[PDB]
Design a protein around this ligand. Sequence first.
Ligand code: JF0
Ligand code: JF0
Ligand code: NA
Ligand code: NA
Ligand code: NA
Ligand code: NA
Ligand code: NA
Ligand code: NA
Lengths: 58, 58, 245, 242, 242, 49, 48, 297, 99, 49
Amino acid sequence: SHENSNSATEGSTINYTTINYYKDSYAATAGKQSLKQDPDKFANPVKDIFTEMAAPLK
Amino acid sequence: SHENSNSATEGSTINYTTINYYKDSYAATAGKQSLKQDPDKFANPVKDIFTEMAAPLK
Amino acid sequence: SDRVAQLTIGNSTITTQEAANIIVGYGEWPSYCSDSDATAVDKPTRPDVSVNRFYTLDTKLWEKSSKGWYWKFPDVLTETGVFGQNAQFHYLYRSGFCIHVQCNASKFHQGALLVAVLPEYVIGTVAGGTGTEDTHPPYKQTQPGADGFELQHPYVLDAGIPISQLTVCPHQWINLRTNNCATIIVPYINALPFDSALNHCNFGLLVVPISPLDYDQGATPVIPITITLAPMCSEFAGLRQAVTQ
Amino acid sequence: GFPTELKPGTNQFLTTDDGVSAPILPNFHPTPCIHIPGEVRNLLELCQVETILEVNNVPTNATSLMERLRFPVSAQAGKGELCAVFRADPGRNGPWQSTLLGQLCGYYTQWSGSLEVTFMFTGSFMATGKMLIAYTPPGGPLPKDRATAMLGTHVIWDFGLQSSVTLVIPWISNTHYRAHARDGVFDYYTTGLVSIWYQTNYVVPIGAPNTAYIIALAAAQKNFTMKLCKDASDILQTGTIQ
Amino acid sequence: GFPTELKPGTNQFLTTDDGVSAPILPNFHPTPCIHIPGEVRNLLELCQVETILEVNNVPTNATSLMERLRFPVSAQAGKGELCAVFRADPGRNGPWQSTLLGQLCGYYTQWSGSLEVTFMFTGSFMATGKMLIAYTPPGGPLPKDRATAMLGTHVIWDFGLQSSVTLVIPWISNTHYRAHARDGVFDYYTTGLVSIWYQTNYVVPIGAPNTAYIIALAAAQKNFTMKLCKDASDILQTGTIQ
Amino acid sequence: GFPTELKPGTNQFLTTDDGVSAPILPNFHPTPCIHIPGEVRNLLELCQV
Amino acid sequence: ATAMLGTHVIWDFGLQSSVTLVIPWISNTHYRAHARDGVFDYYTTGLV
Amino acid sequence: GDRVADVIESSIGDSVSRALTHALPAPTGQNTQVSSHRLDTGKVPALQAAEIGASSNASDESMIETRCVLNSHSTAETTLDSFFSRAGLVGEIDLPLKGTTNPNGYANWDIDITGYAQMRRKVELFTYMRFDAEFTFVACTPTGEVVPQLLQYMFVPPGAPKPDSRESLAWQTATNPSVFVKLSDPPAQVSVPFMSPASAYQWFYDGYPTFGEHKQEKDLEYGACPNNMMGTFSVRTVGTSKSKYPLVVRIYMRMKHVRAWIPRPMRNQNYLFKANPNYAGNSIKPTGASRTAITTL
Amino acid sequence: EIGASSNASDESMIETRCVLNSHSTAETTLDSFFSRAGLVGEIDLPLKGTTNPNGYANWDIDITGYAQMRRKVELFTYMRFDAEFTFVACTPTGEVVPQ
Amino acid sequence: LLQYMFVPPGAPKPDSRESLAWQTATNPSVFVKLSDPPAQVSVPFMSPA
Ligand SMILES: Cc1cccc(-c2ccc(OCCCCCN3CCN(c4ccncc4)C3=O)cc2)c1
Ligand SMILES: Cc1cccc(-c2ccc(OCCCCCN3CCN(c4ccncc4)C3=O)cc2)c1
Ligand code: NA
Ligand code: NA
Ligand code: NA
Ligand code: NA
Ligand code: NA
Ligand code: NA
């Protein structure tokens, strides 16, 4: 459709697949999100990464 | 669609994108208008335009 | 080779021979505000070396009964050096931080401090004990300045949330048998590109002993904990007269 | 018939719903539209047009209302004396309410952009002078003296053939948009203060008025926009309009 | 009009129905989204982050709450004495409730995956020792002695420069997913038991504390997932929140 | 909106109607189906026993 | 707190017995004459 | 132009925020690979240094002998939209006949969803959130009965006149959006866009909304951020005469197109007030169940 | 005096940075501002009354009896448009009856 | 007007007509009137087996 781009997720690293009947995109359904994940951002935010086999304090 | 052209905006400098199910165009939605603007028509209706850098009264 | 380290920024250099690597919060380095994210139109001032350097602001004493403390950023610096001045003369401020918490002892002492950074650390009160009184923490408690402030109930971080889950935030531990310092780099965190360094504290620094300090009679009993921090990529805009609050 | 299932919202009347409704007059064709001058396409076109700012919003008796349209300047004692002050908040009660910008602003919840105020000196040709007009971004209290005001964004105006000068109130905010500011927590969206001081002095020779007036005209810059349409704070009717 | 026929479901309001509803503000455009650090895309990202496990969940008076965050070890009599025990069931009442994993777990009816608990020794540098940490799969009763515990999945931890060790609680189930376990027929979904024993002994020289503490951090492995979204067992409000 | 007209049958609940109904658990994925012996596809399979 | 505002080093004791404080050349003139109490204090290098 | 070297080589102005991690696709749980006995020196996966601040990197494969397992378990239900896009109660508004509260046939409700624990705890898991939402309005009498009554719901954004009565001129609603609907009709439902002046709403704001001295009497404003205050929800029975029936309006919110930043520890003490995280000091309870001893179940 | 507004911009009055403004101008179009249903007429049909006690009523189509709407349209001298009219009926208490 | 709520194992079961559990922030619920047609929904295969 040729609608307005007023969705809260316009320009997101994860694209969505939705349905809508109005000219304003935020009226659209939640749809399906993309399944990307970045655990390291929280679980391993270290500068100099340390291997599994090696001892963490060299 | 092949409808009548009885919309109040038929023949406007700004084209619209609308929806309708009836044979009379004025029944259609408001849709999206085109985003053109002519501020000078009101803010600067002078015959001999004067630059920004120069002094307005030469 | 991960234990030894040197941090040099501005005219200041820090060394440590018992480190535990470096944490870069949420996995990203501080950066200046892009032209697309910005909104204010005036050309910013970026003092560089005169404000992005290490400032050693406070020292607390770790005791067998210490509860823990917290500091608010950028509150801690608003009245120090050239950074403070810029924060006072300007309406808008933005920057990142390199936090270096120090605490050394001996191979005969023991204890573990949890050092973490919690964005938008909103303080709460005990609500009159019974929870019927809608009290509110006073300015001196929400923005304690450089002396920091001691946690009244560390278990719930004085905000009704479990400290046991504080590790979901950028953090490091100072386990005396292992390291004598924590280093955490933090990017600017806010929902706006710039903000007031006076009215809004972007995050809080928490230092809480989870494993009590201990040692035998005869070992040095005075174990200080010192806080050193450096702004990074500081930017200021919206200039006028200086204001303290 | 075809299997359908009604969802919530059914039968509701949303005043802003842009739907399709049956036409009452089939095959009716409207009177053609001739050319008419001055067609406006967007309210922003109007916001760039300067209208008079009532900086002198003090007189209230009917006979003196016209005095609100201009403030004075006159020979002083050269101590960098203060001439006038006003908040820059455009959608806030005060001077800005006299401007079309302020009024149109009332129909929107949020705004964003730089503003401009042009001051026109209406004294005699022989009168001269230099004024310092300053804009103090949020956080800065009303400047106690000219030296303090001078630390913010400002312009030093010199009277001459060019009767007017323009103070630009650049967009300096923490947020991309400001809601209408007012006393309370919403003062968070305040734009700041504008103060006018005597840089030199109003000088005039023998035979010319010792007092002249300045007229302020304000409008928005081309980066100005508004959003979140709302009803204006005023409703100009008491009882039923007959 | 077009022939339609309403089916059951008509007019109902399903809280989880992902439908389309009319927009209240036509042509409204949201404030652009700047870059903000730490964006999370999936709750599973959070489940891999270790949080403190309250193995020592016995003290209850306010002044001692912080003691729940760590348990002790101290010089023994070398009889392979027991140090501590706890169920591995993550979505069950007990130690796991202190962890973010346990809390997020409460919003899902079923889970599947391996778990991990990392133990950090906080004693003095001069303290040494070897502990045996075991995981007893379903069916195995609380090990009466170290010899019995040793028959299951386990790790023998040696204190040294590396302050911590990781016990992996591998996914060993009969079903692909486990629902939250609890006393009763639902104990069918129990994960098992974790017991900690002294392999050698906590040894320390003259001049160092005879008691030190261990802090346990737990999270999920990368094969962990959850399903069938539900409301958490707790509702943190008594009366109306004012 | 679009011109529609309700026909008889409207609102009725036919127990054998093979229709479409809203899903209560969006994005839910069922436990995978392992191999199980003895799958029957048609009752006629049983009638020959 | 005041000293900390200048050029400095934070030394940590360990296997490396020593640390080096660099007293960088920060002068108004290209050369300094020998400093001493009086007008020649103009050439002072500073304090450690 | 530039000429001195320190200027040419400086990094002052780099707007490209270097990131140490990137997101990878993960539609299913990770599989398990076959493994065998390893009797090596130097190699030590089991040992870690939690002090660093990172979680363990040790996996099943390196701690025990594992078989191969093809894990097709989906990660779809744990996405933000899956977790949050479920309508939940966020507001209740009473319109009684003979009463102490709203005995005038109308009512104003500040749009704040923090008065309900289930929803509040979920969103407070994150510091910043940006989303669109679907609101549903369920009306009926206090007994749950449906009556032939017409209502008007009007969204009053900050700065717009709040109706002061059932007959206020503001109900002309020439610009504000309003919904006229009967109790007999199905619940009213509409879509709402992300409306903050900020790039995201934030459930926590550690600061003050204005400059100045922050004396005792202004502490009610600590933590108040206008960017989160979207306005008022006004409702009235549509008539110049009082309604014949007492009404109740329940408000349900279903977020959609969600983005969240900065995860935080989850609330573990009962909520007391909407505006703050205050907790009952004399009833600080452990986060969970407790037992008699650490060596017994 | 010329009658034109100032042409001075931010760039020429202070030192500015570069800002990429993506703020939309969509909500200030005529249709955006006016295409919002507002009250323009109220008609009474009482039983025992002074006005229309006969079960019918005539209303001259004039929308100037209501301030909110009137002030908005009076911003312009000439206007051309199509319109969508909605009729909401009920008793004086807001009750719905089979009429 | 009635409210039907699906309470999966582990979720709090309402203990009264006024229970907090009816906030139904995560469980799926259906609000419907007796005057409306029968409520109808689709349910997936939910066993761990
Ligand atoms: C046509 C119509 C009629 C009646 C109501 C509405 C309506 C109501 C609410 C709308 O706003 C929804 C706002 C949802 C987020 C609310 N927030 C955002 C941040 N926040 C918050 C609360 C407490 N502390 C910090 C943040 C909130 O409570 C939009 C339209 C629309
Ligand atoms: C099938 C049906 C049933 C009942 C009513 C209608 C209906 C009612 C009004 C219609 O007219 C709408 C006219 C809108 C503009 C009215 N104007 C145009 C100019 N104007 C005005 C008022 C005062 N001074 C100057 C101009 C107005 O009040 C069309 C159809 C149609
Ligand atoms: Na129609
Ligand atoms: Na229609
Ligand atoms: Na028909
Ligand atoms: Na709808
Ligand atoms: Na049919
Ligand atoms: Na259905």
